[PDB]
Curated annotation (Swiss-Prot), chains A, B, C, D:
Residues the record marks as active site: H317
UniProt short sequence motif FYXDWWN motif, positions renumbered to this chain: 260-266
Tissue: Expression seems confined in hepatocytes and enterocytes.
Topology feature Lumenal, residues: 44-58, 111-118, 210-226, 326-331
Name this polypeptide is given: Sterol O-acyltransferase 2
Entry note about domains: Each protomer consists of 9 transmembrane segments, which enclose a cytosolic tunnel and a transmembrane tunnel that converge at the predicted catalytic site: acyl-CoA enters the active site through the cytosolic tunnel, whereas cholesterol enters from the side through the transmembrane tunnel.
Mutagenesis / variant outcome for changing T162A: Does not affect ubiquitination and sterol-regulated stabilization
Binding annotation for an acyl-CoA: N272, R275, N278, H282, Y290, S313
Record's subcellular location: Endoplasmic reticulum membrane
Residues that, per the record, bind cholesterol: H20
The organism of origin for this protein: Homo sapiens
GO cellular component, one term: endoplasmic reticulum membrane
Positions bearing Cysteine sulfenic acid (-SOH): C160
Cytoplasmic compartment residues: 143-176, 253-300
Length: 375, 375, 375, 375
């Protein structure tokens, strides 16, 4: 099987036309309005803009380092393919663009001492460009195993909200500029929501870990106290970056099949959650690691490949965090792995939800402790 | 107009057959499961059963005081009507046995020093019996203005989840004992949820008001800190007592028109919220105070009657709280009245939601302050 | 008259298909190859990359200041028009976007001490956005004098290589990505050519003005010595930025009428030179200042309007330089004005060419003297 | 094959009817006008006539030595042919009067100490007369191998701008005295241009070689500094002497086939440059050395003959310079030979252009060094 693209609509958008979800959405903006009013009234007797101005420290440098990587991934893979499919150098040149968007985004991140948020930008624009600079290549190589795709398609592909290089991409009539304006306004409102959640419900609880005790009561009640910013951070990450950001960019570009996420909130088991959360990266990962795995290995055993894919995902995410916060502290992978082992060796939706809540609680707690015991 | 009863089903129940609301519902039970696991793990190194055992102090006395009340409202109204509609003493009987249900529930509440939760029972039961006893009378009197309803109907009426005496009451085929068992299980799970919210997120913040400062920063940040238990208390009150309790009792009795609440969460303006929140008491109140008001006054001016009804509601609710917590501190009525004045003299749904959030925040904050500065 | 757009080709491109111009072009790249070989061989016993790394000092800041101005000019004028043509605020809001891309690009240029080359960027992206944010407005207002243009057209307009808002823009079949790659390669080769010309034939002659004499022989022979970098700077500015840059951007966007310049090298008189050099800004300037001048003034006298337009151009260019090099030294305007006066009071192509050569010679000489006597 | 003459017109003249080349031509006269104005203004606070008056020292002697030469080549070849084709002394006469034009122009050049420019006259005139006297003879001898051309034709031939004796010479209707006046005016303007280039951009840089260092940096940067007078000297030599001088003399005489040069500026390879630069001497040289070589040798190997011809040309040119500047310093032949070897053992137009630029740069540099280290 290979994924085939339809003119289906982002699931939450086809829900939001129902009234009750317009209500829930309104309740959440009301939540923001209470936070802004209360914080404005307190800090009057200025705002928590400090986390923003601190976290985006050298954002200028972070973007002028985004340009070289973008130009590398735009030119190097295409020229590699076009010249390599002309009978060369191509077997090397592909190497350089392996080493330029692998070495540069670390050198400018460590040697210049960037903050967390202005660093994550580059982290994400070296595990994008490998995912595509490789997707594109492995898609358009088996066309040349016949004993050169249109460039305009490859340019369009680098910005298109999917990681699969299909060069068809079913498109929509026109650009609803009102809709994209709304989506960006929501995405920026979402960043401001996250700014408040951190600056109000994370920093105050976690600042005082210089405290001597390290009593297990104190730690476990810190975990329970921190589980809620955990879930709102997840819901915000999800909503903004998988509904607002990719729809906005799928409306500027007139893209179809905007199923970037299936309803993960209905995922009975855990694997279903992981398949239906961030479906774009899942589909890239699924396609390449689970239809080159079962092809090259040709293994009747598939469970090996399921866990194979998922540890590839876990290792990638652990690396992302190990880079952003500048630690080597791999909590998430140990959690995912150990309970992976637990459920796979030894109404059902609720157990998944509870374990996801504690997953979030543990990750946020230990990462705040590590960020405020390394400073 | 007079309200007429159909075999419609409780709006949230017709929503819960949709999958995404089964998910939200599951997320909330997962919330409970996290609280029980974390609290069990913390109190291990017993539970917060103390608030329950304290709050239900003389619950035996609270119920053996409920019995005289129930017998008074069962017998006195009917015997009065039956003898009064036989041409007497009825005019004296009702007036003399309107005091038992008015005097007794205060005498056993103040002179015996009951806790809050074991007192609110008798508060709700005295207002409940006043409401539906008077309803019954004023419904069945104009039948006698002709120059005696079946008793079994009146007995059934006292337990029926409506306050309007219609003596038709469209009924359902049979009793789904699985469904009522589920609804009571949810209602009791809801009480346990409220027990955790109080014992974990209200008592700790509000215990230390013996603190001298009374600094406006401290108070306003306590209000913001307390706005969230406020909203969960409201949602729990609503869900348990207007969907679980009255559906359970509307399934044991085989009642129709289970529209005890319209979608208040879609109420654009405030009046709409008040008309569509606790629709049962609204409809009683609406019918009697707004179709005896506009009849006896015969006033072309109706806005007077709108505010008339709403201050009747506010005064009743203020009285309920003034009784339960044993204060004379009327915060809610001042808030409702003042912003009533504000909006009625001087996407729109969001403003209502934000002001409801702060309404909850102020009420919970000041009532916790008053309960822990009167003790 | 109003300018109307045809599918004509950039004049130099329709010349370059002739062979002899491919030769001249090749001679000039050979010139670059000699410079790179000779400088590489000298500096071996590294390169003149110092002028580049110095001149682009805070280029990150220069671009993250480009983003706010771009967003201001994108949103403010359109919203102003759309709401103003709905019967307001619009009469103010237009003011803010007057003050944001007028105040910000000075504040970030002076208060942060930017170099020359990283400053000119912002200079040019505040006399672009006024030229358009005003062109667009004054085009689409007389449509509303009838007692709202498509936004997509306005977005496309901000990047389109013309300053006239026509919202038709005759377009070409497809994108010749080979051609745009070639044009950008030439534009970057051109920047490198200018880098060599400065770092080899300007800095060495002009560095030693700390020298006491100020003898008129020394100055006049410095002027003759510097007249040649003057002409190559002009030819490079012209070729790269009016043939390479705007063709590249007119090929990515599929734009017609690429007559950004007529053959100014054939301009018999001076006015003809100014009309046929940078025809895009000329046509904006021509249209607005010479078809609102002769409309509002309604003056039978037009010579006044000719000089009117040209002093508007001169003042704008003087301001550009007064900003970039951070001087108040207005040499160009005095030269243009005085010889303007000279020829307009008191084979012919050659005189124009000679006076252009000395114009370049004087400007480059005095600006190098001023930059190395203010440092 | 033997070259056959058509009524084609000098390629640059058929280009100059196009407007853009009238512009380039005008730019160059403007260059002269800037030089004359700037030098007049500098030497005011007389001109560089000193190089002219010095370089043309004994020009009277140089011309009264030209007369005996011209009379020898006019009479000796013809009388020899006429008497030799009468059956004698001719075999002795020519051999005895081939020494007058070989011995005299050296004796009057060395024994009288002439300057460079007044000497080059006699150099060119001795090689010119050798070339066309021998041409005439070897053309009109095989007519006598039959077991006497009209003299007027031979007189006309000595002044005709070709070196091939064809005695047909397709002629034009009339003498455009305006055109010849223009061409001589340009040729004299060209000499004045070369006078300025030497007196302004060669003498100053090269005067100070008495300087001790002989540092390789100093020499190599002198080569780069001197490459530009090199190219303008070449372009001037070419333009004046191959378009102005020979057209002027081809218009006074009413000559056809004025293709004295093909477009060498389009020569892809080097051999093409040498075949299409100074086509008149090339055609003489080609015809005699490459259609007596391949006749007498009868060699299947032709590459030998290609290099044969070219070293004949190189040796002749080396001799010309060895005579004019009075050195024995053969730089040009070593350069031509070595890179000949380089390319013939071990868009393409650009490499030729770059190597031509450095060829000019090296020749001018080393010849200025040798002229100012031998004085
Ligand atoms: C340290 C950091 O930067 O994370 C920020 C944060 C919000 C992330 C954002 C992250 O978003 C990204 C980059 O994907 C997300 C959502 O992504 C993963 C990935 C996996 C996973 C998936 C497949 C296989 N193996 C592991 O497990 C998870 O539960 C989650 C978590 O929920 C996280 C978190 C929400 C957990 C709470 C975190 O907050 C802090 C301060 O620590
Ligand atoms: C002191 C007490 O016993 O209240 C318990 C509590 C939960 C109540 C339950 C109550 O439930 C009842 C008895 O109806 C409810 C919901 O009912 C009203 C009534 C009116 C109202 C309506 C019409 C006219 N005038 C006023 O406005 C409100 O927002 C609310 C509030 O939300 C409250 C509260 C939720 C506010 C927060 C409170 O918590 C504490 C500790 O103070
Ligand atoms: C100081 C600076 O940044 O200029 C750089 C430089 C290259 C500019 C670039 C500039 O390019 C721009 C911004 O337009 C350009 C070409 O634009 C004008 C404009 C007018 C003019 C036009 C109409 C009315 N009034 C005056 O007069 C001119 O001759 C020229 C000149 O040639 C200049 C120059 C080439 C003169 C030599 C300069 O070099 C130095 C170091 O001083
Ligand atoms: C020393 C001298 O008198 O030369 C004057 C000068 C201008 C000559 C004029 C000369 O003009 C003549 C006599 O033909 C010319 C152009 O002719 C040749 C001949 C060959 C050649 C051709 C075939 C085979 N082998 C060698 O290669 C060349 O590039 C060139 C050069 O460019 C030169 C020069 C331009 C080089 C620069 C020189 O300036 C100085 C001061 O040294
Ligand atoms: C712009 C600011 C206010 C951010 C708003 C975030 C809100 C609108 C987004 C973010 C996460 C989203 C929620 C995440 C998933 C679910 C579970 C599903 O069973 C009901 C919808 C619901 C509850 C979504 C509703 C919309 C949502 C709440
Ligand atoms: C709440 C405070 C810390 C603000 C946090 C700012 C960071 C975490 C947010 C704000 C804007 C977001 C970025 C904007 C869009 C992109 C481009 C995409 O290709 C990769 C993710 C990335 C780079 C986002 C990652 C998360 C992000 C960087
Ligand atoms: C039994 C325990 C877990 C209590 C469960 C409480 C949950 C299931 C009840 C109580 C209050 C209810 C919510 C109150 C009103 C709204 C707003 C509406 O736009 C979406 C549904 C939603 C969000 C309801 C869903 C169900 C709900 C959340
Ligand atoms: C969270 C802690 C304080 C538990 C609170 C217990 C109280 C507030 C709850 C638990 C059971 C509830 C009662 C059960 C049912 C009835 C009968 C009805 O006719 C009036 C309301 C009344 C009397 C409810 C009022 C609220 C109630 C008394
Ligand atoms: C890429 C590097 C080498 C820059 C190249 C610059 C060259 C190719 C460009 C820049 C300026 C241009 C010249 C400016 C104007 C003229 C005058 C005209 O009558 C002939 C063409 C000519 C001479 C142009 C030819 C092409 C040109 C010389
Ligand atoms: C020779 C050395 C000093 C390098 C000079 C770099 C400067 C002068 C060059 C290099 C790139 C050029 C810029 C690139 C493109 C633009 C965008 C356009 O909308 C305004 C002009 C502007 C901003 C150019 C101005 C001149 C420029 C800034
Ligand atoms: C009389 C004075 C000013 C001397 C004038 C010299 C000028 C007019 C002559 C001398 C050498 C000639 C140039 C040499 C060869 C080329 C290369 C060709 O691809 C374009 C024409 C061009 C550029 C010629 C144009 C005319 C030219 C520049
Ligand atoms: C720039 C300064 C040095 C002036 C140079 C003067 C010399 C180099 C110039 C000026 C006039 C030219 C001469 C005029 C015409 C002829 C006759 C021809 O049959 C041989 C070449 C010859 C003899 C020319 C050679 C070069 C020449 C001698
Ligand atoms: C495990 C790592 C997760 C990586 C997340 C990748 C995000 C989705 C990837 C590609 C589609 C995004 C295209 C639109 C964003 C353009 C923004 C930009 O280029 O700056
Ligand atoms: C303003 C005060 C609000 C009063 C709330 C009244 C609740 C609804 C009234 C009557 C229907 C309830 C019938 C089912 C409960 C019977 C419980 C019992 O008798 O113990
Ligand atoms: C007198 C000031 C001269 C201003 C020069 C203006 C240049 C021409 C103006 C607009 C067309 C340019 C459009 C293409 C450039 C896009 C570059 C960018 O947005 O960064
Ligand atoms: C290699 C040496 C180059 C020799 C260059 C020869 C120049 C061309 C030869 C003959 C045609 C010239 C005829 C016109 C000039 C006559 C001048 C005169 O007699 O004074």
């Amino acid at each position: 099987k290979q994924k085939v693209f339809i003119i289906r609509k982002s699931l939450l958008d086809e829900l939001m036309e129902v009234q009750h979800f317009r209500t829930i959405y309104h309740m959440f903006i009301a939540g923001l309005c209470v936070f802004i009013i209360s914080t404005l009234a307190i800090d009057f007797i200025l705002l928590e803009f400090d986390l923003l101005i601190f976290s985006f420290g050298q954002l200028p440098l972070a973007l002028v380092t985004w340009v070289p990587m973008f130009l590398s991934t735009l030119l190097a893979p295409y020229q590699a393919l076009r010249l390599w499919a002309r009978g060369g150098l191509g077997c090397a040149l592909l190497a350089a663009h392996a080493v330029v968007l692998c070495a540069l985004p670390v050198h400018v991140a460590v040697e210049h001492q960037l903050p967390p948020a202005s660093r994550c930008v580059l982290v994400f624009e070296q595990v994008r460009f490998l995912m595509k600079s490789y997707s594109f290549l492995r898609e358009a190589v088996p066309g040349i195993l016949r004993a050169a795709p249109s460039f305009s398609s490859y340019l369009y592909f680098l910005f298109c909200p999917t990681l699969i290089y299909r060069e068809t991409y079913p498109r929509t009539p026109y650009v609803r500029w009102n809709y994209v304006a709304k989506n960006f306004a929501q995405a920026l409102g979402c960043v401001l929501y996250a700014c408040f959640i951190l600056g109000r419900l994370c920093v105050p609880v976690f600042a005082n870990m210089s405290r001597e005790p390290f009593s297990t009561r104190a730690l476990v009640l810190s975990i329970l106290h921190a589980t809620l910013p955990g879930i709102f951070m997840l819901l915000l990450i999800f909503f903004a970056f998988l509904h607002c950001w990719l729809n906005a960019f799928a409306e500027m570009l007139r893209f179809g099949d905007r199923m970037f996420y299936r309803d993960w909130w209905n995922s009975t088991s855990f694997s279903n959650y992981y398949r239906t959360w961030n479906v774009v990266v899942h589909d890239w990962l699924y396609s390449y690691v689970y239809q080159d795995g079962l092809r090259l290995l040709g293994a009747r055993a598939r469970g090996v490949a399921m866990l194979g894919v998922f540890l590839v995902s876990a290792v990638a995410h652990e690396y992302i965090f190990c880079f952003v916060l500048g630690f080597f502290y791999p909590v998430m992978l140990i959690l995912f792995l150990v309970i992976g082992g637990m459920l796979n060796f030894m109404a059902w939706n609720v157990l998944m939800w509870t374990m996801l809540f504690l997953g979030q609680g543990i990750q946020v707690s230990l990462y705040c402790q590590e960020w405020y015991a390394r400073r």
